[PDB]
Amino acid sequence: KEMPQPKTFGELKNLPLLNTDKPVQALMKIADELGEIFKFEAPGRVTRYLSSQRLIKEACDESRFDKNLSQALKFVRDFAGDGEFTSWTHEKNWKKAHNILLPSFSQQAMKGYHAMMVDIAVQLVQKWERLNADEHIEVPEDMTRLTLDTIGLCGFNYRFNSFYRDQPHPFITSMVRALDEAMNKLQRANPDDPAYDENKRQFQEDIKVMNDLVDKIIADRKASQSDDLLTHMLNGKDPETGEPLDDENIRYQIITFLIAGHETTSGLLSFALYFLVKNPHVLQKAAEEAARVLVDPVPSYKQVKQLKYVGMVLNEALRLWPTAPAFSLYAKEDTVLGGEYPLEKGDELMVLIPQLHRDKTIWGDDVEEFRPERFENPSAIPQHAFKPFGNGQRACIGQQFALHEATLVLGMMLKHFDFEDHTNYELDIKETLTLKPEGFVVKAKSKKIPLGGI
Ligand code: HEM
Ligand SMILES: CCCCCCCCCCCCCCCC(=O)NCC(=O)O
């Protein structure tokens, strides 16, 4: 079968279709028009975008495809290096990092992070209880304060103190600019036009800000007994090789985990709150569970694990708007995809996750509705139908960290406040490679339930 392909622009082929501030949403619209697979060509590069579970399940076969660095991740690698997110599976530092850092995500480790996650969640609840009657909440802004603070504290014993700042933390400002520039470089046909000189200067200055922060984390740790993610980065030995990470790689890991470890989580909490306010009956169910389950002044680790419906709400937000919305594969050898599409060794595929999650042959016709009951019995969901955390040995290492944090915080929010979508907010999804609502504001009325000490 010949592969569908969207409209072209002469010798720029499909490239100018990425000349938009919302490229993923543009690709989703193309997949809607063109179907489960389409080709996207740019000068000197081709990729194929997959949207159906039937083809994505094949792409998820690790004997035939391996993780690829999409052009977006190659640009991120300019500041994330061979950190765990932007390394190739065949690079020595990927498996060594994965082996050294995995223990930081064990259940025993998670039980150990719980108190520090509560410390930050209590700061969030206190900030909102302290608002005056005439004020409102800027949701994605506060969720980024919470999630950055939480990976800082749990992962690095470092306080960003983001709730002490009315503007974004300077790491956030540089990170966002750096991910923005990566996204913007995707549609640049001549990246070395001197018209991009100031883009390049500003990129370097952004990277220097992130690395100065990494310096402070490393120095604060030297000056400081912890056993956290940074402990394993600095001292952990890979059981296979017996070697620890080198200093250069360790700096890439800290940048990696500070970014990967909070940005997508902030997106998830923002979208879950959005869907809750837009679906009052769902919000009533979740708030009922939070009140029934969270009987103590602050939540315990077991209580969080008991918030089943809140967990379903977060999964159903990840179904509609997975906040790292694509991952890319390459063919290990020549092969035929779906019995219809021949690929040569090295050909790249991109999995368009929001489109996979709207495959009506899996989910039924009502894929746009927000229905957490979809996830009541997760074992009934077909393999490779639901993939917000990527695939196989390159799947997200921090998936349980993110879900525990989001479930704890959303459970505390729902216990402590009633929420009003006071402006009838129209969803506007800002892209910086990752997805988050922009402009989403709410009002929160305290239920005046006292909050225990940290
Ligand atoms: C809801 C929140 C999250 C989402 C949706 C998410 C999504 C993903 C996805 C889609 C990938 C695969 C990327 C690819 O194949 O190119 C991935 C990998 C990764 N994520 Fe997450 N992530 C989240 C939270 C986290 C957190 C909290 C951490 C750290 C504490 C983290 C650290 C990582 C790392 C280090 C990788 C690379 C894993 C490897 O290849 O060894 N992520 N994530
Ligand atoms: C260092 C940790 C990095 C954390 C952020 C990771 C970003 C997640 C990637 C999301 C996918 C973005 C898709 C961008 C649009 C697209 O398809 N571009 C084509 C291409 O990238 O080559």
Side-chain angles (χ1 to χ4, degrees), residues 45 47 49 67-77 85-86 88 186 326-329 348-350 433:
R45 61 172 171 110
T47 192
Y49 282 87
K67 170 153 165 161
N68 178 54
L69 304 190
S70 54
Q71 291 296 309
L73 292 189
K74 295 178 175 151
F75 297 142
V76 169
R77 178 163 171 131
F85 204 111
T86 48
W88 303 95
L186 296 180
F327 56 95
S328 180
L329 301 148
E348 297 172 41
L349 297 178
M350 294 283 339
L433 303 185

mmCIF file of all heavy atoms in Angstrom, residues 45 47 49 67-77 85-86 88 186 326-329 348-350 433:
data_model
loop_
_atom_site.group_PDB
_atom_site.id
_atom_site.type_symbol
_atom_site.label_atom_id
_atom_site.label_comp_id
_atom_site.label_asym_id
_atom_site.label_seq_id
_atom_site.Cartn_x
_atom_site.Cartn_y
_atom_site.Cartn_z
ATOM 1 N N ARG A 45 15.202 14.299 5.470
ATOM 2 C CA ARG A 45 14.704 13.386 6.525
ATOM 3 C C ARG A 45 13.278 12.881 6.283
ATOM 4 O O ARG A 45 12.480 13.560 5.637
ATOM 5 C CB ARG A 45 14.951 13.888 7.951
ATOM 6 C CG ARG A 45 14.325 15.153 8.334
ATOM 7 C CD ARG A 45 14.470 15.433 9.793
ATOM 8 N NE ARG A 45 14.034 16.810 10.153
ATOM 9 C CZ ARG A 45 12.930 17.115 10.854
ATOM 10 N NH1 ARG A 45 12.095 16.147 11.263
ATOM 11 N NH2 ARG A 45 12.643 18.395 11.156
ATOM 12 N N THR A 47 9.996 10.564 8.266
ATOM 13 C CA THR A 47 9.543 9.736 9.351
ATOM 14 C C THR A 47 8.125 9.280 9.030
ATOM 15 O O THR A 47 7.449 9.830 8.146
ATOM 16 C CB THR A 47 9.604 10.436 10.722
ATOM 17 O OG1 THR A 47 9.405 9.438 11.779
ATOM 18 C CG2 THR A 47 8.526 11.412 10.869
ATOM 19 N N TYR A 49 4.342 8.535 10.815
ATOM 20 C CA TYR A 49 3.574 8.720 12.053
ATOM 21 C C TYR A 49 2.519 7.690 12.131
ATOM 22 O O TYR A 49 1.728 7.561 11.183
ATOM 23 C CB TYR A 49 2.900 10.102 12.041
ATOM 24 C CG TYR A 49 3.911 11.199 12.400
ATOM 25 C CD1 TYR A 49 4.690 11.787 11.439
ATOM 26 C CD2 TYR A 49 4.053 11.617 13.718
ATOM 27 C CE1 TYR A 49 5.605 12.800 11.782
ATOM 28 C CE2 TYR A 49 5.016 12.582 14.075
ATOM 29 C CZ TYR A 49 5.789 13.152 13.088
ATOM 30 O OH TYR A 49 6.682 14.178 13.416
ATOM 31 N N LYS A 67 14.178 2.048 20.474
ATOM 32 C CA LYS A 67 14.012 3.524 20.654
ATOM 33 C C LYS A 67 14.908 4.338 19.711
ATOM 34 O O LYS A 67 16.148 4.158 19.638
ATOM 35 C CB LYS A 67 14.357 3.925 22.100
ATOM 36 C CG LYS A 67 14.448 5.471 22.270
ATOM 37 C CD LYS A 67 14.123 5.895 23.741
ATOM 38 C CE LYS A 67 14.606 7.355 23.928
ATOM 39 N NZ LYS A 67 13.949 8.002 25.121
ATOM 40 N N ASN A 68 14.296 5.361 19.072
ATOM 41 C CA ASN A 68 15.051 6.266 18.221
ATOM 42 C C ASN A 68 15.075 7.644 18.902
ATOM 43 O O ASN A 68 14.156 7.996 19.663
ATOM 44 C CB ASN A 68 14.334 6.387 16.885
ATOM 45 C CG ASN A 68 15.007 7.337 15.935
ATOM 46 O OD1 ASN A 68 16.172 7.209 15.670
ATOM 47 N ND2 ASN A 68 14.245 8.308 15.388
ATOM 48 N N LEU A 69 16.146 8.408 18.683
ATOM 49 C CA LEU A 69 16.021 9.814 19.068
ATOM 50 C C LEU A 69 15.382 10.593 17.950
ATOM 51 O O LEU A 69 16.029 10.758 16.900
ATOM 52 C CB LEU A 69 17.400 10.376 19.358
ATOM 53 C CG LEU A 69 18.207 9.597 20.427
ATOM 54 C CD1 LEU A 69 19.498 10.507 20.776
ATOM 55 C CD2 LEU A 69 17.371 9.344 21.712
ATOM 56 N N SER A 70 14.131 11.008 18.163
ATOM 57 C CA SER A 70 13.451 11.863 17.184
ATOM 58 C C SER A 70 14.279 13.131 17.026
ATOM 59 O O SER A 70 15.136 13.424 17.848
ATOM 60 C CB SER A 70 12.039 12.234 17.670
ATOM 61 O OG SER A 70 12.135 12.816 18.962
ATOM 62 N N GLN A 71 13.986 13.942 15.997
ATOM 63 C CA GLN A 71 14.767 15.167 15.842
ATOM 64 C C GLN A 71 14.571 16.050 17.119
ATOM 65 O O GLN A 71 15.489 16.704 17.540
ATOM 66 C CB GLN A 71 14.267 15.967 14.625
ATOM 67 C CG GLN A 71 14.571 15.317 13.296
ATOM 68 C CD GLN A 71 16.063 15.217 13.056
ATOM 69 O OE1 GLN A 71 16.788 16.212 13.176
ATOM 70 N NE2 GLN A 71 16.533 14.004 12.724
ATOM 71 N N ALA A 72 13.402 15.966 17.723
ATOM 72 C CA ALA A 72 13.145 16.785 18.930
ATOM 73 C C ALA A 72 14.133 16.311 19.998
ATOM 74 O O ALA A 72 14.761 17.126 20.668
ATOM 75 C CB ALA A 72 11.671 16.570 19.428
ATOM 76 N N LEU A 73 14.252 14.995 20.197
ATOM 77 C CA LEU A 73 15.158 14.548 21.270
ATOM 78 C C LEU A 73 16.584 14.817 20.898
ATOM 79 O O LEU A 73 17.430 15.016 21.760
ATOM 80 C CB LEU A 73 15.042 13.050 21.607
ATOM 81 C CG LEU A 73 13.740 12.545 22.264
ATOM 82 C CD1 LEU A 73 13.826 11.106 22.744
ATOM 83 C CD2 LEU A 73 13.299 13.508 23.468
ATOM 84 N N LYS A 74 16.944 14.733 19.615
ATOM 85 C CA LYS A 74 18.300 15.156 19.293
ATOM 86 C C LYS A 74 18.614 16.597 19.671
ATOM 87 O O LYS A 74 19.794 16.898 20.031
ATOM 88 C CB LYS A 74 18.633 14.926 17.808
ATOM 89 C CG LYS A 74 18.635 13.447 17.489
ATOM 90 C CD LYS A 74 18.928 13.203 15.971
ATOM 91 C CE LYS A 74 19.047 11.714 15.647
ATOM 92 N NZ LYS A 74 18.639 11.465 14.234
ATOM 93 N N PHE A 75 17.645 17.499 19.499
ATOM 94 C CA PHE A 75 17.892 18.866 19.960
ATOM 95 C C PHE A 75 17.972 18.939 21.497
ATOM 96 O O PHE A 75 18.718 19.707 22.012
ATOM 97 C CB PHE A 75 16.794 19.807 19.440
ATOM 98 C CG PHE A 75 16.778 19.892 17.948
ATOM 99 C CD1 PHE A 75 15.590 19.961 17.238
ATOM 100 C CD2 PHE A 75 17.967 19.963 17.258
ATOM 101 C CE1 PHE A 75 15.618 20.075 15.832
ATOM 102 C CE2 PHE A 75 17.967 20.097 15.862
ATOM 103 C CZ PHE A 75 16.773 20.161 15.175
ATOM 104 N N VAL A 76 17.144 18.162 22.189
ATOM 105 C CA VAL A 76 17.189 18.179 23.654
ATOM 106 C C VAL A 76 18.560 17.660 24.111
ATOM 107 O O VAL A 76 19.146 18.096 25.130
ATOM 108 C CB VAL A 76 16.035 17.376 24.264
ATOM 109 C CG1 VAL A 76 16.237 17.165 25.804
ATOM 110 C CG2 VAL A 76 14.666 18.119 23.978
ATOM 111 N N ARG A 77 19.097 16.718 23.334
ATOM 112 C CA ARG A 77 20.389 16.154 23.705
ATOM 113 C C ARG A 77 21.516 17.211 23.712
ATOM 114 O O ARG A 77 22.576 17.050 24.384
ATOM 115 C CB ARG A 77 20.706 15.004 22.720
ATOM 116 C CG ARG A 77 22.025 14.362 22.965
ATOM 117 C CD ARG A 77 22.108 13.009 22.258
ATOM 118 N NE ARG A 77 23.495 12.467 22.315
ATOM 119 C CZ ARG A 77 23.824 11.235 22.685
ATOM 120 N NH1 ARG A 77 22.898 10.374 23.055
ATOM 121 N NH2 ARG A 77 25.111 10.847 22.677
ATOM 122 N N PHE A 85 17.286 9.786 29.294
ATOM 123 C CA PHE A 85 16.156 10.031 28.353
ATOM 124 C C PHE A 85 16.687 10.154 26.897
ATOM 125 O O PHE A 85 15.966 9.772 25.926
ATOM 126 C CB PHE A 85 15.359 11.326 28.763
ATOM 127 C CG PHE A 85 13.932 11.359 28.290
ATOM 128 C CD1 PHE A 85 12.934 11.247 29.220
ATOM 129 C CD2 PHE A 85 13.593 11.547 26.958
ATOM 130 C CE1 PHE A 85 11.539 11.284 28.833
ATOM 131 C CE2 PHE A 85 12.204 11.623 26.545
ATOM 132 C CZ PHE A 85 11.212 11.445 27.474
ATOM 133 N N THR A 86 17.885 10.728 26.728
ATOM 134 C CA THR A 86 18.317 11.033 25.378
ATOM 135 C C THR A 86 19.506 10.216 24.933
ATOM 136 O O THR A 86 20.269 10.670 24.086
ATOM 137 C CB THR A 86 18.661 12.574 25.203
ATOM 138 O OG1 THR A 86 19.504 12.990 26.276
ATOM 139 C CG2 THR A 86 17.360 13.351 25.261
ATOM 140 N N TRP A 88 20.999 6.588 23.339
ATOM 141 C CA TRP A 88 20.614 5.417 22.563
ATOM 142 C C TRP A 88 20.770 4.176 23.411
ATOM 143 O O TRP A 88 21.636 4.121 24.262
ATOM 144 C CB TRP A 88 21.542 5.286 21.325
ATOM 145 C CG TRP A 88 21.523 6.521 20.437
ATOM 146 C CD1 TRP A 88 22.399 7.592 20.453
ATOM 147 C CD2 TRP A 88 20.642 6.730 19.339
ATOM 148 N NE1 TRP A 88 22.050 8.498 19.457
ATOM 149 C CE2 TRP A 88 21.011 7.957 18.727
ATOM 150 C CE3 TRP A 88 19.560 5.985 18.805
ATOM 151 C CZ2 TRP A 88 20.285 8.504 17.633
ATOM 152 C CZ3 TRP A 88 18.874 6.493 17.660
ATOM 153 C CH2 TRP A 88 19.247 7.733 17.098
ATOM 154 N N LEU A 186 12.583 22.492 15.048
ATOM 155 C CA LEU A 186 12.074 21.439 14.204
ATOM 156 C C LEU A 186 11.643 21.946 12.801
ATOM 157 O O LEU A 186 11.660 21.169 11.876
ATOM 158 C CB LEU A 186 10.855 20.743 14.849
ATOM 159 C CG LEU A 186 11.054 19.974 16.163
ATOM 160 C CD1 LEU A 186 9.678 19.354 16.641
ATOM 161 C CD2 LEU A 186 12.128 18.918 15.955
ATOM 162 N N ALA A 326 4.735 11.886 22.279
ATOM 163 C CA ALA A 326 5.140 10.970 21.176
ATOM 164 C C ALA A 326 6.422 10.273 21.611
ATOM 165 O O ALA A 326 7.130 10.782 22.504
ATOM 166 C CB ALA A 326 5.383 11.796 19.788
ATOM 167 N N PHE A 327 6.714 9.110 20.998
ATOM 168 C CA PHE A 327 8.078 8.542 21.167
ATOM 169 C C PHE A 327 8.379 7.900 19.850
ATOM 170 O O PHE A 327 7.475 7.718 19.044
ATOM 171 C CB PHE A 327 8.151 7.564 22.343
ATOM 172 C CG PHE A 327 7.157 6.402 22.308
ATOM 173 C CD1 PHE A 327 7.526 5.162 21.778
ATOM 174 C CD2 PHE A 327 5.902 6.519 22.934
ATOM 175 C CE1 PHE A 327 6.630 4.097 21.850
ATOM 176 C CE2 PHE A 327 5.020 5.476 22.981
ATOM 177 C CZ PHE A 327 5.363 4.268 22.388
ATOM 178 N N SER A 328 9.654 7.658 19.590
ATOM 179 C CA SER A 328 10.068 7.371 18.222
ATOM 180 C C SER A 328 10.850 6.066 18.265
ATOM 181 O O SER A 328 11.503 5.767 19.310
ATOM 182 C CB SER A 328 10.991 8.531 17.789
ATOM 183 O OG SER A 328 11.441 8.317 16.453
ATOM 184 N N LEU A 329 10.777 5.300 17.167
ATOM 185 C CA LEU A 329 11.420 3.956 17.069
ATOM 186 C C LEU A 329 12.182 3.919 15.761
ATOM 187 O O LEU A 329 11.851 4.638 14.828
ATOM 188 C CB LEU A 329 10.400 2.809 17.040
ATOM 189 C CG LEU A 329 9.627 2.980 18.346
ATOM 190 C CD1 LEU A 329 8.294 2.573 18.245
ATOM 191 C CD2 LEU A 329 10.346 2.408 19.596
ATOM 192 N N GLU A 348 12.553 5.377 10.480
ATOM 193 C CA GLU A 348 12.047 5.914 11.747
ATOM 194 C C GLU A 348 10.556 5.931 11.759
ATOM 195 O O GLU A 348 9.900 6.182 10.730
ATOM 196 C CB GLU A 348 12.578 7.359 11.927
ATOM 197 C CG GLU A 348 14.142 7.295 12.025
ATOM 198 C CD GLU A 348 14.801 8.679 12.015
ATOM 199 O OE1 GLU A 348 14.246 9.579 12.684
ATOM 200 O OE2 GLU A 348 15.855 8.873 11.339
ATOM 201 N N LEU A 349 9.996 5.672 12.935
ATOM 202 C CA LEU A 349 8.554 5.673 13.118
ATOM 203 C C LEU A 349 8.329 6.623 14.296
ATOM 204 O O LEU A 349 9.166 6.665 15.260
ATOM 205 C CB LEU A 349 8.067 4.328 13.598
ATOM 206 C CG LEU A 349 8.281 3.140 12.645
ATOM 207 C CD1 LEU A 349 7.782 1.821 13.291
ATOM 208 C CD2 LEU A 349 7.571 3.436 11.320
ATOM 209 N N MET A 350 7.218 7.339 14.295
ATOM 210 C CA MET A 350 6.870 8.132 15.474
ATOM 211 C C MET A 350 5.533 7.684 15.939
ATOM 212 O O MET A 350 4.587 7.621 15.137
ATOM 213 C CB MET A 350 6.700 9.622 15.111
ATOM 214 C CG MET A 350 7.879 10.337 14.661
ATOM 215 S SD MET A 350 8.972 10.753 16.067
ATOM 216 C CE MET A 350 7.890 10.667 17.414
ATOM 217 N N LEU A 433 7.368 20.765 23.290
ATOM 218 C CA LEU A 433 7.546 19.335 23.143
ATOM 219 C C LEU A 433 6.500 18.628 24.009
ATOM 220 O O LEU A 433 5.597 17.979 23.491
ATOM 221 C CB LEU A 433 8.972 18.833 23.474
ATOM 222 C CG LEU A 433 10.100 19.503 22.650
ATOM 223 C CD1 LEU A 433 11.387 18.820 23.007
ATOM 224 C CD2 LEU A 433 9.798 19.347 21.153
#
